[PDB]
């Protein structure tokens, strides 16, 4: 009976389903499994369920001679060395689709919060500042940015990006996108227009990032790109922190190159930066894009389905490295 | 040349347009005009531009013998004694439409922030607590409520309510509404379904209030209605504070009768309440529904147009108390 290590307490639906087909060890602690502890525990396993926090690299593969499949509890897989996995006949799966709507909802929450000063406004009320000042209402108090009918620019036009666009249609927006290729069916269905990155940045009132982290997306939103954005524009990052040059973003926010930003993801996590966190025109969330009951349950069910399919000699439904099919047939 | 007092520093477009046709006094101070000061200044005026903060009642009318028209810098007019105005031949105008998109955007900002813990999350990051606890990401961290595909119940289905529904369509929602009359064109255009209030409250995952304050809407969201709502539901109030029984809402939030609330408006303003302000599951904004430059500019242009139309012997374009037309012809 094959052994699986699950590196965090995922929802019980997934754990229980895996227990029917695997011997299951779960890392029970809130904190990330320590690196030395991971390398010790993988020695014996046939499968892994990993979080974005575990770096599944050559060193891990060398420590886990029986390892045949890694199911990421995440749609991103920048934490896994995919090419090295393929070379070794190791299957890698992810969790697309089940978290699309949670992440797109969160991107929209950030867009609107940053646009209309929701965080600063809440503190203004909650701290008693509103009351202490004695002024109920003023025609110039807390003026923010219109969203309805404006232009949204979506960087990355896959599952999450297109979901962000569906919501934008409810807001009557002009929709621009960039991607590695045109998406002509999505253009027709969503009314979206393909643009080079730099033209998108120049024309957009709202820029939302929904790309994977790759060599090519690393620091794509740098100083030069931030300078192209409108001074009234709002930037939202629900992708990966390293897509943005944080030092450049801090200058942009402080000096008024852009109006505001909503950030769910950071170059190091958990993140603290005194300079960024002092700014009224940033809205911050602790990497909670996929944090709904429904999404996290669906993720758990999907990691389980992938490992069970593999055990049954089937191609896992959300296999990422399809080239591995030529290296080794599925199964333990 | 007729005299107008404008009780707040509204956008210059409106003030300047009025200066072409009226002798204009503007109350330019940060604080609202004191009651005793208002009663002194109205003695001499032919017209007023008022904010929601000024109570235009029998006492004001008795102090202002030349007063023929009051233009509220607001779509709401619960601060004006309309029946007494009509009896005296005084025309009352408001600012519909020009602020609809700002207010509906803000309602959506509140809905999403309350649903996904944006305010609480921001403080968790900004304070350094996220970093100090040392955990980047966890499958159970900050789980919130799915919005896409859920049911929204919109209480009041006029200009702002229908705008809230247009946005909901981008979120693929089932749309319920209640109002004093059925809206068959809106049903066809928006896919919205009419329900009695109590069925709407039972069936909705998100309830948004967009009614005026009247004798009938006063405390309509009371203990009984909050108990009918789902324990997972989110309530958003962009209407008037007095539509909700705040004491009952506090019990509902604390005891889990509903999940969360987003509030832009309160029974007293500015508002202070230690019990409500202690709650993680409320999101607060300081009555900033119409707070975009474009909304506020349009409001200013519209108050000016109303007073100028009246001066010209025309029916003002956003006259509220149309029965006054039988009492006195327009003009000074
Ligand atoms: N904040 C969170 O909690 C959270 C949650 C889930 C996901 N995420 C992040 O969101 C990412 C996207 O997920 P998804 O399901 O939408 O993935 P996806 O369907 O693969 O979409 C990614 C899109 O990015 C585009 N892209 C890739 N490299 C690009 C480049 N260099 N320039 C421009 N566009 C580029 C792709 O273009 P092509 O289609 O032309 O190849 C694709 O359209 C994940 O990889 C993850 O890092 C974050
Ligand atoms: N938070 C802010 O900054 C902000 C900004 C602007 C406005 N507001 C508030 O929002 C209100 C609505 O503005 P609007 O332009 O949408 O007005 P509206 O177009 O007159 O719409 C009001 C809707 O409420 C309905 N209604 C009235 N009494 C009701 C009751 N007892 N039960 C159920 N529905 C009832 C009306 O029914 P019928 O259609 O049958 O008449 C109508 O559908 C304003 O009056 C103001 O108080 C707040």
Author numbering:
A (entry chain B), B (entry chain A): 2 to 333
Give me lines lifted from the publication on this model.
Glyoxylate is a small and very reactive dicarboxylic acid molecule synthesized by most eukaryotes and prokaryotes. Considered as a toxic intermediate, this compound is metabolized by an unusual enzyme assigned to the D-2-hydroxy-acid dehydrogenase superfamily, glyoxylate reductase/hydroxypyruvate reductase (GRHPR). First, GRHPR is a dual activity enzyme. It catalyzes the reduction of glyoxylate into glycolate, which is either excreted or reconverted into glyoxylate (futile cycle) and the conversion of hydroxypyruvate into D-glycerate, a precursor supplying in the gluconeogenic pathway carbon.
To go deeper in the specificity of these enzymes, we determined the crystal structures of PfuGRHPR and PyaGRHPR at 1.4 Å and 2.0 Å resolution, respectively. The asymmetric unit of PyaGRHPR crystal displays a full dimer. The electron density maps obtained revealed that Pfu and PyaGRHPR enzymes are in ternary (enzyme + cofactor + substrate/product) form. Neither cofactors nor substrates were added during the crystallization or the cryoprotection step. Both structures include a cofactor molecule, unambiguously modeled as NADP(H), within each active site with a refined occupancy of 100%. The PyaGRHPR structure contains D-glycerate, product of HPR activity as observed in the holo form of human GRHPR12. Contrary to what was observed in hGRHPR structure, both active sites in the PyaGRHPR dimer are occupied with a D-glycerate molecule. The conserved Arg241 was proposed to orient and to hold the substrate for catalysis through two hydrogen bonds with the 2-hydroxyl and carboxyl groups of D-glycerate respectively. Additional interactions for substrate orientation are provided through carboxylate oxygen atoms forming charged hydrogen bonds with the main chain amines of Val76 and Gly77. In the PyaGRHPR structure in the presence of D-glycerate, the network Trp138, Ser291 and Arg297 superposes strictly with the one identified in the human structure.
